[PDB]
Amino acid sequence: MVDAAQYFPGTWEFRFRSSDGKEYRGTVEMQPRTPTEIEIRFKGQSSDGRPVEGRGSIEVRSPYEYRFEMQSSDGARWEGTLQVRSPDSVEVRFKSSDGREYSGEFRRQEG
């Protein structure tokens, strides 16, 4: 597995989409708080154009996989896991407080 504080810090673009077609896109900045807790700050917007922002984290908790959580200024609360696929690409799968199931991707940017 990747080393959390080696791998995740940086700027990423994201796209998340639910099975019903709701979609969020935006940019995140990740930085370590500790080696087991990577903080996320993000700005983005839903597919209806509504701007959102918020915070989240990637954490070491379970023995099996990274924990992923994000909370949005429009009230969306997201909790799930992720799978690193390459040096610049991470897939995510999560449940939302609105009852939706999402999949999505982070794509690493320069700066």
Q: How far apart are CA 51 and CA 54, in angstroms?
A: 11
Burial class (CB in 10 A: 0-12, 13-18, 19+), 90: buried
Residue-range definition of the domain harbouring residue 70: 1-111
* Pair 52, 24: CB distance under 8 Å: yes
**Beta-ladder partners of 51:** 45
Structure tokens at 38: 């990577």
Tell me which DSSP letter residue 27 carries.
E
Task: Give the total number of structural domains in the chain.
Answer: 1
Q: How was this structure determined?
A: X-ray
